[PDB]
Amino acid sequence: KPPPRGPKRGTKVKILRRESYWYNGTGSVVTVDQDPNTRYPVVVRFAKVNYAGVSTNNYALDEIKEVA
Amino acid sequence: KGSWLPGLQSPAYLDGSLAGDNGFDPLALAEDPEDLRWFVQAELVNGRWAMLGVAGMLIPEVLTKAGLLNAPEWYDAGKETYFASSSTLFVIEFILFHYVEIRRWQDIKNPGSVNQDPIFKSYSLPPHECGYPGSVFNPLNFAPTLENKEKELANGRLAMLAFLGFLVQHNVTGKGPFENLQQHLADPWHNTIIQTI
Amino acid sequence: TVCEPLGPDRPVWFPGTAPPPWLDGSLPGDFGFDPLGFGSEPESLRWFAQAELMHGRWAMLAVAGILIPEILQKWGFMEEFSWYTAGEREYFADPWTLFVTQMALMGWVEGRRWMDYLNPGSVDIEPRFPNRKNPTPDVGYPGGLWFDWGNWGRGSPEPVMVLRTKEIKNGRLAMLAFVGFWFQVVYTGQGPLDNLFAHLADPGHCNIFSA
Amino acid sequence: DIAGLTPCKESKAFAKREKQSVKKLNSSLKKYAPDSAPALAIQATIDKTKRRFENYGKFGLLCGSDGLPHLIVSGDQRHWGEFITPGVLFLYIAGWIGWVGRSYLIAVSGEKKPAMREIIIDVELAARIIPRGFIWPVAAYRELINGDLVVDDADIGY
Amino acid sequence: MRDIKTYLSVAPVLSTLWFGALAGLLIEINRLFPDALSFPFF
Numbered sequence A: 001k002p003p004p005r006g007p008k009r010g011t012k013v014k015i016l017r018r019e020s021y022w023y024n025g026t027g028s029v030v031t032v033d034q035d036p037n038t039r040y041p042v043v044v045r046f047a048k049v050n051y052a053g054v055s056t057n058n059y060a061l062d063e064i065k066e067v068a
Numbered sequence B: 001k002g003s004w005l006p007g008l009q010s011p012a013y014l015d016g017s018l019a020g021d022n023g024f025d026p027l028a029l030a031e032d033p034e035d036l037r038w039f040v041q042a043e044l045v046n047g048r049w050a051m052l053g054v055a056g057m058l059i060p061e062v063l064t065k066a067g068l069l070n071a072p073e074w075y076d077a078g079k080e081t082y083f084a085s086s087s088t089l090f091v092i093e094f095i096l097f098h099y100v101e102i103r104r105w106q107d108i109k110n111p112g113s114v115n116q117d118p119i120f121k122s123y124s125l126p127p128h129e130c131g132y133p134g135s136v137f138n139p140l141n142f143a144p145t146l147e148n149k150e151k152e153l154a155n156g157r158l159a160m161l162a163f164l165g166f167l168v169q170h171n172v173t174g175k176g177p178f179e180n181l182q183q184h185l186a187d188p189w190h191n192t193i194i195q196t197i
Numbered sequence C: 001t002v003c004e005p006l007g008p009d010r011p012v013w014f015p016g017t018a019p020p021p022w023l024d025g026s027l028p029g030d031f032g033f034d035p036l037g038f039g040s041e042p043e044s045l046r047w048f049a050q051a052e053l054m055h056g057r058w059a060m061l062a063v064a065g066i067l068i069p070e071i072l073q074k075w076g077f078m079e080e081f082s083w084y085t086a087g088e089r090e091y092f093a094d095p096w097t098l099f100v101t102q103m104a105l106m107g108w109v110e111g112r113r114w115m116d117y118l119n120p121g122s123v124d125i126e127p128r129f130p131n132r133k134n135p136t137p138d139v140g141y142p143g144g145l146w147f148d149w150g151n152w153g154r155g156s157p158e159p160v161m162v163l164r165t166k167e168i169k170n171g172r173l174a175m176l177a178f179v180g181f182w183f184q185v186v187y188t189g190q191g192p193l194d195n196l197f198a199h200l201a202d203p204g205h206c207n208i209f210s211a
Numbered sequence D: 001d002i003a004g005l006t007p008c009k010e011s012k013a014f015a016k017r018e019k020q021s022v023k024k025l026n027s028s029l030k031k032y033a034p035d036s037a038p039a040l041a042i043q044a045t046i047d048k049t050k051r052r053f054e055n056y057g058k059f060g061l062l063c064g065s066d067g068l069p070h071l072i073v074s075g076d077q078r079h080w081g082e083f084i085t086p087g088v089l090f091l092y093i094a095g096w097i098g099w100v101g102r103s104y105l106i107a108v109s110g111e112k113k114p115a116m117r118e119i120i121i122d123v124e125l126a127a128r129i130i131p132r133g134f135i136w137p138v139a140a141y142r143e144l145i146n147g148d149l150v151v152d153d154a155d156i157g158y
Numbered sequence E: 001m002r003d004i005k006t007y008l009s010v011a012p013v014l015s016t017l018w019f020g021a022l023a024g025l026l027i028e029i030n031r032l033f034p035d036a037l038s039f040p041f042f
């Protein structure tokens, strides 16, 4: 009943953060932790792997655009 | 309709609404509808002027070789001396065509816009079908029906082909194509593309 | 359509050996001989079957055209000389005109046949007066009274697979014959009947090892 | 005669180069049998370079002060059989290749992991995409007309 | 069989055969048009 933040599922997101490899990038939400003590509760998978070999990381909601 | 390949399925691009459909696009050019329209208009104009040109090639040649007339070859008519010098008639052609063709293009971009002769307000135009203009073009009240558009397009395609043939055969020979036909009828085996190389 | 699975119905080309499982023996002329297993997948299998049939028929025609005129030269009235040197024989027209006409007509025909292969029944020539139902197809055996007017490929004269077996076997043999004739003319300088008679006279020595 | 360069249909140093070349070739030729296949090929190359000199003396080739051809790419189509027509021909070829590659990639982009088809080409799709070269001028044209050739603010990811 | 097809579609061998064919075409053109410097057609 308390409205869970973050997009629902599968919503392609456009990254607003500047200091990530995927600035102006199109990723996919995989889950969002409903805990209001988090500081980066959304997590996004991509189809392009970055330099460190990783393909996932965290964000807040402000650095997201729920594109579709 | 008549898929020119008794086994191949026609692509969705060429359904059969437009005249002369045979699914003849093994390279999928016009798979975008507006480009299909573009090439429809281009084929129309190319075929019409190709019919014109192939007539102007063939008929003068035979009427001259018949002794009834005397007129140079279509290629031998440039250097001929007329009442007008080349450049004069050429620039008159240029201005008149830059009027007519730009009006045609404006009609292409905008269906039913440039209709009236903007000089006088009556006498102007009955609304048309794109690629098939109205009254002042079809004075004999011919009904624009099927088997007319198909015949037009088929004759025009063959005319394009025949014109390219004229051009390349003049390239390899420089002679009158009807003379090539006479030599051919002499001996089709001794007279063909093979011997002339 | 009769199957020839393993057992006595399956005389193996290599006695005492189990044939490759994907070689059932449906296609007449099969004996379980594919050590390279090229017929592994079915699409390749049918493609190679079509290629085999075409090669066999063309080889039959070629070996007939080699053999018959040479013997009719040797003893018959007209003297058709070396067929291998008939390729450069001089005719009314040049060889390139012949080549391009051959290519045009054969391209037409073989292209229609190609489309029939890719799309069975969609390209066929079998008229239909009312109330008489036409036959189907088995590609490689068009049927209808265009290529079977004797009504031999359907039933009565012989169970089908047996006659197709005859055809494929004779075709393999004719392929061997054509390659043999060509290779001989590469080595020797006579026709097939000449080599034949030379071998008949001196079987013990007049051979490849004669030199 | 651009800046005084006479065509070697008329110059002399060209004739001197030709003479010296055929002379050294002929002097080399007389060290074998007049019928030996190497000597035959030598004479073949002799007549070949000779007819080369002849061909050059047939197509308006303005020719240097030292006996060498010298291209004239100034734009005048009088000497165009060197740059303009071969230039546009190669441009046609390059546009062919660029467009066919781009179209293949744009097509195959829609798969699970397009890398597997970028290392191992979809030779069937490759064969039914490849001959489209005859469309590369016009097709791309319409693209730019419809703005479906470039992108505005999609940079990373796709 | 299909395995060897997918293997043959791996870029090395495809590239080798493509380049061989292209080089053959070029050397044949050069044979049939020795030294081919200008464009003496138009």
Ligand code: CLA
Residues within 6 Å of the ligand: B158, B161, B162, B164, B165, B166, B168, B169, B172, B173, B180, B181, B183, B184, B191, B192, B193, B194, B196
């Ligand atoms: C309307 C079409 C048409 C017609 C009637 C002709 C007719 C003729 N051409 Mg020709 N030609 C054409 C188109 C045509 N051509 C085209 C498009 C080209 C460019 C590829 C050529 C290139 C060409 C050359 C280079 C030469 C001829 C020559 C000839 C003449 C001898 C035939 C020959 O050598 O084979 C013609 C050779 C071709 C390559 C023609 C191919 C045409 C294609 C396949 C379409 C035609 C198919 C058509 C349905 C069948 C003929 C229709 C006819 C029965 C009504 C003959 C009068 C020769 C000549 O003048 O010597 C006497 C010659 O040297 N033609």
Ligand code: CLA
Residues within 6 Å of the ligand: C176, C177, C179, C180, C181, C183, C184, C187, C188, C194, C195, C196, C198, C199, C206, C207, C208, C209
């Ligand atoms: C049907 C198959 C067949 C038959 C009956 C013949 C028959 C003959 N060949 Mg021959 N040959 C054949 C295939 C065949 N060949 C093949 C496939 C090749 C290519 C390698 C050759 C290459 C060849 C050369 C280079 C020469 C002959 C010669 C000869 C003649 C003398 C025998 C000899 O020394 O050669 C023996 C032949 C071989 C060793 C070839 C081996 C290949 C065959 C297929 C052996 C298999 C036997 C066969 C399958 C079983 C019988 C089948 C059937 C006839 C009952 C003789 C008429 C000579 C000649 O001109 O005569 C004076 C000669 O110089 N042949």
Ligand code: CLA
Residues within 6 Å of the ligand: D097, D098, D099, D100, D101, D102, D104, D121, D126, D130
């Ligand atoms: C068809 C594919 C294709 C296309 C359309 C382009 C297009 C472009 N490239 Mg390029 N490039 C490609 C492939 C391609 N490239 C490949 C494979 C490489 C790695 C070798 C490069 C390396 C490269 C560099 C290093 C640079 C460009 C640049 C450019 C731009 C200017 C043109 C230039 O300088 O190229 C010059 C020509 C080349 C570099 C040759 C590469 C073309 C290859 C050989 C074609 C590949 C075709 C394909 C792999 C074969 C499959 C065929 C089909 C059946 C699938 C232009 C947007 C420049 C740029 O940034 O401009 C702003 C630049 O600096 N490219």
Ligand SMILES: CC(/C=C/C=C(C)/C=C/[C@@]12O[C@]1(C)C[C@@H](O)CC2(C)C)=C\C=C\C=C(C)\C=C\C=C(C)\C=C\[C@@]12O[C@]1(C)C[C@@H](O)CC2(C)C
Residues within 6 Å of the ligand: B024, B025, B026, B027, B028, B029, B045, B046, B047, B049, B050, B052, B053, B054, B056, B057, B073, B074, B075, B077, B160, B161, B163, B164, D134
């Ligand atoms: C041949 C032609 C176009 C052919 C294009 C074809 C077949 C394209 C086919 C394809 O695209 C499809 C269908 C589907 C794709 O998947 C496959 C391909 C193959 C790619 C146009 C010719 C077009 C030819 C034309 C328009 C000719 C016009 C001639 C004129 C006006 C003559 C003028 C003169 O004769 C006079 C009038 C007086 C004389 O004295 C002087 C002059 C000036 C010489």
